[PDB]
Amino acid sequence: ERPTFYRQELNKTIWEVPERYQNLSPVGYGSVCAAFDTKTGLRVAVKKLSRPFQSIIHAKRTYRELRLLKHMKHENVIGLLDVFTPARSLEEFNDVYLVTHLMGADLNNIVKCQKLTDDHVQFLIYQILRGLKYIHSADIIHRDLKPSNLAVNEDCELKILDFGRHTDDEMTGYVATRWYRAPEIMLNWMHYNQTVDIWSVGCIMAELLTGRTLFPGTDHIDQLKLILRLVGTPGAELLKKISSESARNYIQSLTQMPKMNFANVFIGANPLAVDLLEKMLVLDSDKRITAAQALAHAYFAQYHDPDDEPVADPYDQSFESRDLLIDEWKSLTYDEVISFVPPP
Numbered sequence: 001e002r003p004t005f006y007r008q009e010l011n012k013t014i015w016e017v018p019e020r021y022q023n024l025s026p027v028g029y030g031s032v033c034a035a036f037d038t039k040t041g042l043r044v045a046v047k048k049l050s051r052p053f054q055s056i057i058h059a060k061r062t063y064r065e066l067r068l069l070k071h072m073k074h075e076n077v078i079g080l081l082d083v084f085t086p087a088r089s090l091e092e093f094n095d096v097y098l099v100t101h102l103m104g105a106d107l108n109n110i111v112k113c114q115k116l117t118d119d120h121v122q123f124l125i126y127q128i129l130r131g132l133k134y135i136h137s138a139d140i141i142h143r144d145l146k147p148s149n150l151a152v153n154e155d156c157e158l159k160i161l162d163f164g165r166h167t168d169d170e171m172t173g174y175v176a177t178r179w180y181r182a183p184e185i186m187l188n189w190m191h192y193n194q195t196v197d198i199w200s201v202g203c204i205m206a207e208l209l210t211g212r213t214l215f216p217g218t219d220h221i222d223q224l225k226l227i228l229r230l231v232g233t234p235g236a237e238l239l240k241k242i243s244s245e246s247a248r249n250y251i252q253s254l255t256q257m258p259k260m261n262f263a264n265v266f267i268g269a270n271p272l273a274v275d276l277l278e279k280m281l282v283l284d285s286d287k288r289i290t291a292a293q294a295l296a297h298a299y300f301a302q303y304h305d306p307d308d309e310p311v312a313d314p315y316d317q318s319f320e321s322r323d324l325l326i327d328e329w330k331s332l333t334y335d336e337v338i339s340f341v342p343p344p
């Protein structure tokens with residue numbers, strides 16, 4: 001049946017949670033507390049969504065996040081341990097809490113201005129690609145892959161968190177929020193797809209290899225110039241695919257540049273790593289390596305197992321193109337909370 005809930009003000013917010021969750025301590029859309037789940041013995045992160053149904057946009061976002069997390073069942077991706085509301089009925093339903101494994105440290109905490117060993121890079125990138133193969137098989141695009149969205153424990157085990165989002169202000173200037181974005185998304189060149197995530201993986205892998213940001217642009221234009229210096233300016237083939245006439249006109253104003261030699265950029269790196277980087281960091285998204293293809297690349301020889309890289313169950317996201325009222329999104333959300341089944 002229904003657990004017993006207890007009340008607690010954490011900072012300046014009232015949190016009402018089942019008794020199983022103890023020692024709630026603030027750690028960070030909503031707010032997150034770390035807690036101890038006495039039922040499972042797990043250190044958990046508990047997220048209370050802020051005004052989940054304040055608008056149609058917010059209500060749809062709440063449903064989106066809950067649907068996403070309920071679907072994700074993979075070792076290298078965030079899983080949903082629990083979801084609850086103190087509400088006893090749809091009528092009084094106003095708050096949503098989400099529970100997952102507590103992230104202790106992220107990728108940034110492990111890079112820390114320093115190079116990693118090649119075996120470490122292999123293992124870390126393998127896990128991102130393993131997770132991505134799974135995410136992409138469900139036709140989901142992360143859209144926001146960066147080191148701070150990747151949890152890594154003490155045994156170097158990685159999970160992809162925080163699916164995509166970001167406003168114009170936070171994408172402005174010398175900011176990590178933009179350094180890992182594919183150029184087609186950064187400058188809205190075209191209708192983008194799953195390959196945007198592969199670009200991000202390339203930027204991440206390079207940074208693990210060198211210990212430095214691959215494209216630390218001081219703004220959109222600076223970052224584009226950094227990108228084109230490395231990969232070369234686009235050819236006619238890609239230009240046609242830039243459906244944004246305006247973005248295409250600006251690109252054409254730039255002096256043509258050839259692709260650089262990646263072995264001269266990534267001095268001393270495993271030639272197999274260099275090769276993979278060349279296949280990920282392709283300007284034309286149509287021609288980038290996919291996660292499934294990248295898993296089979298020689299660089300991951302010691303970790304690759306085609307029988308241990310699972311795909312996702314089908315994910316129905318027809319709700320995305322659906323127009324509903326707040327109360328309707330709210331009822332859908334309530335249905336999903338009530339139907340939740342915890343993992344074993």
Ligand SMILES: Cc1onc(-c2ccccc2)c1-c1ccnc(N)n1
Nearest residue numbers: 032045046047098099100101102103
């Ligand atoms: C960041 C972030 O953004 N959303 C969540 C979240 C998602 C679902 C349930 C609980 C927390 C987290 C998160 C996840 C794990 N650990 C920590 N410290 N934070």
